[PDB]
Amino acid sequence: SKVTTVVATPGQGPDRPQEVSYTDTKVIGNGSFGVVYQAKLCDSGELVAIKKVLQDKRFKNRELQIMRKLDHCNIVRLRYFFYSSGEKKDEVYLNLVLDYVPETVYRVARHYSRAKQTLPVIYVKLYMYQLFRSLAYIHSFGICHRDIKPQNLLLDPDTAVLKLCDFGSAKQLVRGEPNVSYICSRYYRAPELIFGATDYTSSIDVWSAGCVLAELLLGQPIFPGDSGVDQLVEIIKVLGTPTREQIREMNPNYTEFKFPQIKAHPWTKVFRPRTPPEAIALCSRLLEYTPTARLTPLEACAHSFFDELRDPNVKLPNGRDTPALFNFTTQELSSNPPLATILIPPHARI
Amino acid sequence: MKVSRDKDGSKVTTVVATPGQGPDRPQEVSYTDTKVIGNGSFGVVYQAKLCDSGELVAIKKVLQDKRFKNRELQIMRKLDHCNIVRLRYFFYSSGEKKDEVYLNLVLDYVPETVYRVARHYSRAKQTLPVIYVKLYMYQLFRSLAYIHSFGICHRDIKPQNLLLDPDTAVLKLCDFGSAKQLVRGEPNVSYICSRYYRAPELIFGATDYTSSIDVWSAGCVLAELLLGQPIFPGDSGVDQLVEIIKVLGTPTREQIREMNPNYFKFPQIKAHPWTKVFRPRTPPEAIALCSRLLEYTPTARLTPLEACAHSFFDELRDPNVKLPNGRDTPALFNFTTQELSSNPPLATILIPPHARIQA
Ligand SMILES: Nc1ncnc2c1ncn2[C@@H]1O[C@H](COP(=O)(O)OP(=O)(O)NP(=O)(O)O)[C@@H](O)[C@H]1O
Ligand SMILES: Nc1ncnc2c1ncn2[C@@H]1O[C@H](COP(=O)(O)OP(=O)(O)NP(=O)(O)O)[C@@H](O)[C@H]1O
Ligand SMILES: [Mg+2]
Ligand SMILES: [Mg+2]
């Protein structure tokens, strides 16, 4: 019954701090940057995640700046933020108070692989669709996540709601500005990243999404490797050897450097039999060498693989209705507004 | 597998093999009891028993591009050193893919790796006796002094590529599949080397890196053998640089220039005292060596040969030094002119008085 009370600034709206009291503080996670706690708001009894990172008081926190602009049902909500000091004197910590979300795609996928089963396709559809909406939204602001991986896909198992989280690697990509190639986790890195390109687009997130789709179908990572070399060999084993043109599209400086000559492995034979053709088709349009050839997130949402989600009789296996799938805004559809006639089916929102 | 026969039940494979070193006088080689001991992205390693001598060999089988000559082969053919796994002979064959050529490298079989040994001690919540840390690392630094003296950078120094005889304490560097001759001015790919062992210039995507990346990697192996876990783990380069920065502290503008000139936004963190990184009673000489290997500035790192001459290895130069199991240490002082070429005067430290005594 130990209560902590802070004066915390709401994430959205005007910069108007209020007194916030919370209790039942326990460490849900540790990342390189800092610790994540669970806590219960005293007023509502609602559970929150508090992400605590060391802050260079001088400069502004990019993660905070980005999350204050984000309002989407498939992105974890910033409820408050506040500053605290401890450990070393003169060390200030930024605290992000987020909606608590009990599971991850990582943990749920790990359960099914440990028990020798695959995630039922209905969840692959729900989870990937919600990921592609969250990407469609941030990409419409020029914001690239740059760390799309199962650990950063939060899940409410009861409602089947997915929330994208962890904007610590996130950055507004501006044409002609170079960006670091050393972002994004091992198995989910786009080939242009592995080739050390600094002129990459938001399409790195689509490749990462494709790696998550493939992984949920296979029950293991599709492009594993301890080195970039090992990863590229695993990519080449599936896509075949990239053409000199395809290489120019990824990183032009790496044309003269050479790798084994291999023909593309048929996508249908990459996955087990009775993996739905539409799932396989979508993968092939996400995991493309040429960044500009990859589907956009919004195009991905409109893919036939997600048609079951647009069926008026679709239900969760636990009997509940699907979560919000169709509450698109103008911002979200801006990349291609005509897709609205596919994305919003006749039965939705009337 | 050119010709296959049966001998008292056992399957015998007979091949015609080109010798590793010497003129091309083909040798007839017969082996049995084939089993898999290793996999890679583009490689399979078998154990096999030679029919006559009964002695074990490793056969690394890799797909051969008909276009170009195999770089791993070209490099291994040039190498003769007691701390580098010997290419006995090589032969071509068919394999898993019909109409495809496979290069087979027949190597000395070595039963263990630093990876497997380190893992045994980690699981049992022990650390390797420091005499083994000294022997393994010293032998690694000799292997790197030798290849670097030909301008050849390994580019994949990691515990899994360090073969061990546990009884003799002999270490052999293996896996020249990433190895290349670095030529000042020629660019090189930044996506080589296993993730935990990658030098910061590689993480920053440099293409003008020197053989000193192998010294960083060996620094990571030493630290890991002292800690019982990787010193700089991370799923992303970002995560790895955070771990590096937590120890080394934030790199100066000039340190970043020395690593990759092209390259931002990392916490202003002060250096952790290296002493507080390792368990209490870690030999100070071990910690000093680490600090001189794991430097941001590639040129500031010790050369392999300077590493060998470091005070951490003084116990190896003691004339009364034995393995715990009572046996003599392996050869540590049989240096060649080639091996010493980077700094011949270091011989005055490297070859101890007792090793110069007249026979
Ligand atoms: N809102 C939340 N609710 C519940 N768990 C959360 C929440 N946010 C983060 N976590 C958990 O804490 C982990 C780490 O949080 P994250 O936001 O990724 O911090 P980080 O320290 O920046 N990690 P990373 O950037 O991936 O190296 C996540 O993968 C989740 O398992
Ligand atoms: N001479 C040998 N004797 C015994 N085991 C060996 C020998 N050579 C290799 N191995 C084993 O096989 C593993 C792989 O060998 P390696 O030559 O690295 O092949 P690879 O398929 O190219 N692997 P890698 O490049 O690291 O991804 C080593 O880590 C050892 O465990
Ligand atoms: Mg995360
Ligand atoms: Mg290896």
CSV table of N, CA, C and O in Angstrom, one decimal, chain A residues 179-182 189-200 232 250-254, chain B residues 189-191 198 202-207 260 262-263:
chain,number,residue,atom,x,y,z
A,179,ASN,N,20.6,8.4,-42.7
A,179,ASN,CA,20.2,7.8,-41.4
A,179,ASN,C,21.1,6.6,-41.1
A,179,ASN,O,21.6,6.0,-42.1
A,180,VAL,N,21.3,6.3,-39.8
A,180,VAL,CA,22.2,5.2,-39.4
A,180,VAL,C,21.6,3.8,-39.9
A,180,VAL,O,20.4,3.7,-39.8
A,181,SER,N,22.5,2.9,-40.3
A,181,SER,CA,22.2,1.6,-40.8
A,181,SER,C,22.1,0.6,-39.7
A,181,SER,O,21.7,-0.6,-40.0
A,182,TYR,N,22.5,0.9,-38.5
A,182,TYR,CA,22.7,0.0,-37.3
A,182,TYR,C,21.5,-0.1,-36.4
A,182,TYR,O,21.6,-0.7,-35.4
A,189,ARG,N,16.0,-7.1,-40.1
A,189,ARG,CA,16.7,-6.1,-40.8
A,189,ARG,C,16.5,-6.3,-42.3
A,189,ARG,O,16.7,-7.4,-42.8
A,190,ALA,N,16.1,-5.2,-43.0
A,190,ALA,CA,16.0,-5.2,-44.5
A,190,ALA,C,17.4,-5.3,-45.1
A,190,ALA,O,18.3,-4.9,-44.5
A,191,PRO,N,17.5,-6.0,-46.3
A,191,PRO,CA,18.8,-6.2,-46.9
A,191,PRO,C,19.6,-4.9,-47.1
A,191,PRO,O,20.8,-4.9,-46.9
A,192,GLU,N,18.9,-3.8,-47.5
A,192,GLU,CA,19.6,-2.5,-47.7
A,192,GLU,C,20.3,-2.1,-46.4
A,192,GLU,O,21.4,-1.5,-46.5
A,193,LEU,N,19.7,-2.4,-45.2
A,193,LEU,CA,20.3,-2.1,-43.9
A,193,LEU,C,21.6,-3.0,-43.8
A,193,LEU,O,22.6,-2.5,-43.3
A,194,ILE,N,21.5,-4.3,-44.1
A,194,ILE,CA,22.6,-5.2,-44.0
A,194,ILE,C,23.8,-4.7,-44.9
A,194,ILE,O,24.9,-4.8,-44.5
A,195,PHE,N,23.4,-4.2,-46.1
A,195,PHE,CA,24.4,-3.6,-47.0
A,195,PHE,C,24.9,-2.2,-46.6
A,195,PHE,O,25.7,-1.6,-47.3
A,196,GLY,N,24.4,-1.7,-45.5
A,196,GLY,CA,24.9,-0.4,-44.9
A,196,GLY,C,24.4,0.8,-45.6
A,196,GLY,O,25.0,1.9,-45.4
A,197,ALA,N,23.3,0.7,-46.3
A,197,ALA,CA,22.6,1.9,-46.9
A,197,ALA,C,22.2,2.9,-45.8
A,197,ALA,O,21.8,2.4,-44.7
A,198,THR,N,22.3,4.2,-46.1
A,198,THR,CA,21.9,5.3,-45.2
A,198,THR,C,20.8,6.1,-45.8
A,198,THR,O,20.4,7.1,-45.1
A,199,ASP,N,20.3,5.8,-47.0
A,199,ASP,CA,19.3,6.5,-47.8
A,199,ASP,C,18.0,5.7,-47.8
A,199,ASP,O,17.2,5.9,-48.8
A,200,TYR,N,17.8,4.8,-46.9
A,200,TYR,CA,16.7,3.9,-46.8
A,200,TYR,C,15.4,4.7,-46.5
A,200,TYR,O,15.4,5.8,-45.9
A,232,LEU,N,22.1,-12.7,-45.2
A,232,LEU,CA,22.0,-12.4,-46.6
A,232,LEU,C,21.9,-13.8,-47.3
A,232,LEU,O,21.1,-13.9,-48.3
A,250,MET,N,19.1,-1.2,-53.3
A,250,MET,CA,19.3,-1.4,-51.9
A,250,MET,C,20.5,-0.5,-51.5
A,250,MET,O,20.2,0.5,-50.8
A,251,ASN,N,21.7,-0.8,-51.8
A,251,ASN,CA,22.9,0.0,-51.6
A,251,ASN,C,23.8,-0.1,-52.9
A,251,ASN,O,24.4,-1.1,-53.2
A,252,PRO,N,23.9,1.0,-53.7
A,252,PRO,CA,24.7,1.0,-55.0
A,252,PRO,C,26.2,0.7,-54.8
A,252,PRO,O,26.7,0.1,-55.7
A,253,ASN,N,26.8,1.1,-53.7
A,253,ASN,CA,28.2,0.9,-53.4
A,253,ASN,C,28.7,-0.5,-53.4
A,253,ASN,O,29.9,-0.8,-53.5
A,254,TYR,N,27.7,-1.5,-53.2
A,254,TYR,CA,28.0,-2.9,-52.9
A,254,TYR,C,27.9,-3.8,-54.2
A,254,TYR,O,27.8,-5.0,-54.0
B,189,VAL,N,33.3,-5.1,-47.2
B,189,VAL,CA,31.9,-5.2,-46.7
B,189,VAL,C,32.0,-5.1,-45.1
B,189,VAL,O,32.9,-5.6,-44.5
B,190,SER,N,31.0,-4.4,-44.6
B,190,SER,CA,30.8,-4.1,-43.1
B,190,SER,C,29.9,-5.2,-42.4
B,190,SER,O,29.9,-5.2,-41.2
B,191,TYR,N,29.3,-6.1,-43.2
B,191,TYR,CA,28.3,-7.0,-42.7
B,191,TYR,C,29.0,-8.4,-42.4
B,191,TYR,O,28.2,-9.4,-42.2
B,198,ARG,N,31.7,-8.0,-33.1
B,198,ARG,CA,31.8,-7.0,-34.2
B,198,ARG,C,32.5,-5.7,-33.6
B,198,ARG,O,32.0,-5.3,-32.5
B,202,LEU,N,32.8,-1.5,-37.6
B,202,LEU,CA,31.9,-2.4,-38.4
B,202,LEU,C,30.4,-2.0,-38.2
B,202,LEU,O,29.6,-1.9,-39.1
B,203,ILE,N,30.1,-1.8,-36.9
B,203,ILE,CA,28.7,-1.5,-36.5
B,203,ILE,C,28.3,-0.2,-37.2
B,203,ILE,O,27.2,-0.1,-37.7
B,204,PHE,N,29.2,0.8,-37.2
B,204,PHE,CA,29.1,2.1,-37.9
B,204,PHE,C,29.1,2.0,-39.4
B,204,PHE,O,29.0,3.0,-40.1
B,205,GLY,N,29.4,0.8,-39.9
B,205,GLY,CA,29.3,0.5,-41.4
B,205,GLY,C,30.5,1.0,-42.2
B,205,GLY,O,30.3,1.4,-43.3
B,206,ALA,N,31.7,1.0,-41.6
B,206,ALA,CA,33.0,1.4,-42.2
B,206,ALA,C,33.4,0.3,-43.3
B,206,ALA,O,33.1,-0.9,-43.1
B,207,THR,N,34.0,0.8,-44.4
B,207,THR,CA,34.5,-0.1,-45.5
B,207,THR,C,36.0,0.0,-45.6
B,207,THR,O,36.6,-0.7,-46.5
B,260,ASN,N,34.4,5.5,-38.1
B,260,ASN,CA,33.8,5.9,-39.4
B,260,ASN,C,33.6,7.4,-39.6
B,260,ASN,O,32.8,8.0,-38.8
B,262,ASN,N,32.1,9.1,-41.9
B,262,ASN,CA,30.7,9.5,-42.4
B,262,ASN,C,29.8,9.7,-41.2
B,262,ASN,O,29.0,10.6,-41.3
B,263,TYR,N,29.9,8.9,-40.2
B,263,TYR,CA,29.0,8.9,-39.0
B,263,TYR,C,29.5,10.0,-38.0
B,263,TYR,O,30.3,10.8,-38.4
